[PDB]
Short mmCIF file of C-alpha atoms (C1' of nucleotides) in Angstrom, two decimals:
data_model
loop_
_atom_site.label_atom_id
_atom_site.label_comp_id
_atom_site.label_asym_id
_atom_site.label_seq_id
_atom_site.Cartn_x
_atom_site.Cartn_y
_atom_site.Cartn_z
CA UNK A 1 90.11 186.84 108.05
CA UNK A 2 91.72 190.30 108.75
CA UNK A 3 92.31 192.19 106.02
CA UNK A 4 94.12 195.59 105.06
CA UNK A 5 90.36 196.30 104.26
CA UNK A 6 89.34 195.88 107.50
CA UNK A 7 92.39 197.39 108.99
CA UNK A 8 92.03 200.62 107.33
CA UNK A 9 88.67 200.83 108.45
CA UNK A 10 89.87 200.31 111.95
CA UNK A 11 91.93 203.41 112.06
CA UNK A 12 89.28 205.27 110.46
CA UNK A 13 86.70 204.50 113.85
CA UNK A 14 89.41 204.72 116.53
CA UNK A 15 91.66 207.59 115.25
CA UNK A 16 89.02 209.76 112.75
CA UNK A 17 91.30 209.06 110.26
CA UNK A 18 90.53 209.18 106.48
CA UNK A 19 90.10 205.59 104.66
CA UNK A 20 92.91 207.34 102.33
CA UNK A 21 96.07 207.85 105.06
CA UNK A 22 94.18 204.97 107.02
CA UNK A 23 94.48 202.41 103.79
CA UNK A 24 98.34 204.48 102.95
CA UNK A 25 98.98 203.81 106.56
CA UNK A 26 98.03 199.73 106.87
CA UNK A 27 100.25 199.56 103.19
CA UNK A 28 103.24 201.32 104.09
CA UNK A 29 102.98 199.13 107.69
CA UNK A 30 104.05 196.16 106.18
CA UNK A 31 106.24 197.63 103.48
CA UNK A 32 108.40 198.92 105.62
CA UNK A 33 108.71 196.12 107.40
CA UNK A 34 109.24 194.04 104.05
CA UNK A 35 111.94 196.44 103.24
CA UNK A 36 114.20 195.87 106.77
CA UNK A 37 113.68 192.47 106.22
CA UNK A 38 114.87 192.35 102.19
CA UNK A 39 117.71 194.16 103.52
CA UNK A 40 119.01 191.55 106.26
CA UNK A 41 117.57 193.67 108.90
CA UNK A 42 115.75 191.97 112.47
CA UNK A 43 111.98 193.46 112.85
CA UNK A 44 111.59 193.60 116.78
CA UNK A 45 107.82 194.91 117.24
CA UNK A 46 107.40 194.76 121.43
CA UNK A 47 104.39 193.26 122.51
CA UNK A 48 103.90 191.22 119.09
CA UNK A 49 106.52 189.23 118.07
CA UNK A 50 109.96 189.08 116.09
CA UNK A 51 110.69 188.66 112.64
CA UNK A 52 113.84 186.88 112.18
CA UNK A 53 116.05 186.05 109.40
CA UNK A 54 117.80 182.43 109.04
CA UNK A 55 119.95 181.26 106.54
CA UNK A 56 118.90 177.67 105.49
CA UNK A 57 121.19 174.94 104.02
CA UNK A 58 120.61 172.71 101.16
CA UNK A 59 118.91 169.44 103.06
CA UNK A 60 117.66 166.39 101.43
CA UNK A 61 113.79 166.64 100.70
CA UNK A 62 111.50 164.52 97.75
CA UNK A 63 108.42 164.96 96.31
CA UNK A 64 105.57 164.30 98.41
CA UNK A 65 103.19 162.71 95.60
CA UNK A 66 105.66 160.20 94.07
CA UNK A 67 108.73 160.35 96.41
CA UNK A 68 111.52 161.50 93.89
CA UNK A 69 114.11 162.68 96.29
CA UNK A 70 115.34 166.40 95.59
CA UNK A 71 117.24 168.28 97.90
CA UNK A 72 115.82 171.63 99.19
CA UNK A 73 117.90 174.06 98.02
CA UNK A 74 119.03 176.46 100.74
CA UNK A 75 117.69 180.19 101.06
CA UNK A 76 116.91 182.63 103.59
CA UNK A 77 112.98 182.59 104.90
CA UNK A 78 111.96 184.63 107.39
CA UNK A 79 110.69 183.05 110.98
CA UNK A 80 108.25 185.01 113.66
CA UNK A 81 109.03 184.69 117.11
CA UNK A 82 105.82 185.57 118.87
CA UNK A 83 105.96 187.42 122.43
CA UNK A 84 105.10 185.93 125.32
CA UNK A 85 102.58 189.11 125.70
CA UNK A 86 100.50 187.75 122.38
CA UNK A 87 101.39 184.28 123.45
CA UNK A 88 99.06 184.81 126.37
CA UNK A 89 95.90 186.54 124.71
CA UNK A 90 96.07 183.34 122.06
CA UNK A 91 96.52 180.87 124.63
CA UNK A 92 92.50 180.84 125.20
CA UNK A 93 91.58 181.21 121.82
CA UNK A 94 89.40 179.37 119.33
CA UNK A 95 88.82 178.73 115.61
CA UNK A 96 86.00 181.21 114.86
"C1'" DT B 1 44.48 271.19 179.58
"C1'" DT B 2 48.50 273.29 177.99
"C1'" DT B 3 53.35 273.74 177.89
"C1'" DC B 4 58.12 271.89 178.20
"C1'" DT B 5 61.79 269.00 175.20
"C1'" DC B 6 65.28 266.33 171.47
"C1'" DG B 7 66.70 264.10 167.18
"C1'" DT B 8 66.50 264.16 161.57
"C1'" DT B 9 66.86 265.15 157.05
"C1'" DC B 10 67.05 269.02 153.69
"C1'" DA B 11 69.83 272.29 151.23
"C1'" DG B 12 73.11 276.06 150.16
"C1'" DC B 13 77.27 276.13 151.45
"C1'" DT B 14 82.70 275.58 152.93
"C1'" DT B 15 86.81 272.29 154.04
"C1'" DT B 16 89.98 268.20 154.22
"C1'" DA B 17 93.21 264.45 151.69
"C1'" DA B 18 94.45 261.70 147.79
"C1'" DT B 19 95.54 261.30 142.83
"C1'" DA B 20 97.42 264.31 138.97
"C1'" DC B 21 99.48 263.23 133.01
"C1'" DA B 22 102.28 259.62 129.75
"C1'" DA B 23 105.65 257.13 127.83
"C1'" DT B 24 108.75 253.54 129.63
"C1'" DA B 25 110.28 248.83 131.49
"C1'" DA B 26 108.83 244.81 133.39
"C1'" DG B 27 106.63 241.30 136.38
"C1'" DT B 28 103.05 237.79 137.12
"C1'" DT B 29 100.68 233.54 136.51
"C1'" DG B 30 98.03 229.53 133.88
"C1'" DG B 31 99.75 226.47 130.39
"C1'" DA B 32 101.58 224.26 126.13
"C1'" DA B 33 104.93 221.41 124.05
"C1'" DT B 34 109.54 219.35 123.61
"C1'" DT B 35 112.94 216.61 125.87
"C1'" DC B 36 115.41 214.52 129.86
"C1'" DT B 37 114.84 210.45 133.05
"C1'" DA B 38 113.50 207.36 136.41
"C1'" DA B 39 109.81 203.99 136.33
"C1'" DA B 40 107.69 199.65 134.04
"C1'" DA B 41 107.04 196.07 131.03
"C1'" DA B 42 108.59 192.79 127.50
"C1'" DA B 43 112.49 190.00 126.37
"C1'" DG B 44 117.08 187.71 126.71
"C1'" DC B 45 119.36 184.51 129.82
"C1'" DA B 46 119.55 179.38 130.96
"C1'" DT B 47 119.02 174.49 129.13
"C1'" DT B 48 117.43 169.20 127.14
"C1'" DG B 49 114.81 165.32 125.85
"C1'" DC B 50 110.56 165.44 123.46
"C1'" DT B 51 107.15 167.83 120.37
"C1'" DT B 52 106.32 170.51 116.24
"C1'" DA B 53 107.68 173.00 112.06
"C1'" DT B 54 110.56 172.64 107.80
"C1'" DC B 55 109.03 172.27 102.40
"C1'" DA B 56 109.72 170.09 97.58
"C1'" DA B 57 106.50 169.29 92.81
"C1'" DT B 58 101.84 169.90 91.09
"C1'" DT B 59 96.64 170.03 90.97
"C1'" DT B 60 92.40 172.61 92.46
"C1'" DG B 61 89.24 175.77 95.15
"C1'" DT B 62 89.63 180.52 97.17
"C1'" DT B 63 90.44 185.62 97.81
"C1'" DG B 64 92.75 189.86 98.85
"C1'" DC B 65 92.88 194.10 96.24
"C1'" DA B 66 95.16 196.44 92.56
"C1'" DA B 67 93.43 197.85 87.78
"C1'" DC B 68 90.27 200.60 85.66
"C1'" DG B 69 85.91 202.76 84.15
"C1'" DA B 70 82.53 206.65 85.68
"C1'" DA B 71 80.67 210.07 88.89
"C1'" DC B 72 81.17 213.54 92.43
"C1'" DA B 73 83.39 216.65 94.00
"C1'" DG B 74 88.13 219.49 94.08
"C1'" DG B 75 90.48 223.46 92.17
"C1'" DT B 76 91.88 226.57 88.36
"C1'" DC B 77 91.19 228.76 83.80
"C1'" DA B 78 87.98 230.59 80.26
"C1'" DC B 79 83.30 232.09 78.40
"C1'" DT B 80 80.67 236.57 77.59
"C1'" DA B 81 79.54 241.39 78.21
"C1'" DT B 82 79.96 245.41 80.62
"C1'" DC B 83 81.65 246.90 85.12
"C1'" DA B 84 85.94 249.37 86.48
"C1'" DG B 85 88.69 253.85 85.55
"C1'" DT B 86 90.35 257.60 83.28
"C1'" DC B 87 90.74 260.85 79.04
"C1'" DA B 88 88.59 263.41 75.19
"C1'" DA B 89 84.54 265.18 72.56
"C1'" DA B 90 81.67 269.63 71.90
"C1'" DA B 91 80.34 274.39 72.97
"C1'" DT B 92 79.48 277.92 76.15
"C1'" DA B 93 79.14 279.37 81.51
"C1'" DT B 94 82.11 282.21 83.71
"C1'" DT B 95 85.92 285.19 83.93
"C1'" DG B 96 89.25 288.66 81.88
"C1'" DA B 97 89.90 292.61 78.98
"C1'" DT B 98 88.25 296.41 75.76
#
DNA sequence: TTTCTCGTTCAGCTTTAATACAATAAGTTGGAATTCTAAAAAAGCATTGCTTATCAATTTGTTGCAACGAACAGGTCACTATCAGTCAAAATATTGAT
């Protein structure tokens, strides 16, 4: 599984970057990104995807081991719209 | 046989044209880097029945990666004694007067 491990040492064999700015780099990536979102913001990253940001409503849900139904309380998540651009170099993947 | 016959380079001289001397004021020519802009690529537009994700409440195996504890630099201040620099000690050479 990718990792900001593995990321850092990405930049660091394709840019001659440092580890240090190349692991500062891979953090701050998707801290900023946490940040727009936290602040009702819409992360549009071309050729990647979208994050977006729905407000959910309290719907009617239970629990799954017994069946006690408890409604979902609502709350804001936030959704990823892929691009048709990544859409198309996934299309012929496979679990590996 | 013996004599008539010309072009070359050497060397000590003489003569014909361009460039002088300097500080001053730009001009040229190969790029480098920031920013305007048309050229390209990804995405919104457009829509509907059918397909797929939405997620609580709680137990159990998994894992990214910060939290620290040392070691290897990374960068600045001190150890330890005399260089680094400049004035006086100690008495007469040298210079001035009898």
């Amino acid at each position: 599984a990718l990792t900001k491990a593995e990321m850092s040492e990405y930049l660091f064999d394709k840019l001659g970057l440092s580890k240090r700015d190349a692991k500062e780099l891979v953090e701050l990536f998707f801290e900023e990104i946490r940040r727009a979102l936290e602040n009702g913001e819409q992360v549009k990253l071309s050729g990647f995807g979208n994050f977006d940001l729905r407000d959910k409503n309290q719907r009617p849900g239970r629990n799954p081991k017994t069946g006690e139904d408890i409604p979902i309380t609502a709350r804001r998540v936030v959704t990823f719209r892929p691009g048709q651009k990544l859409k198309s170099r996934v299309e012929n993947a496979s679990p590996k």
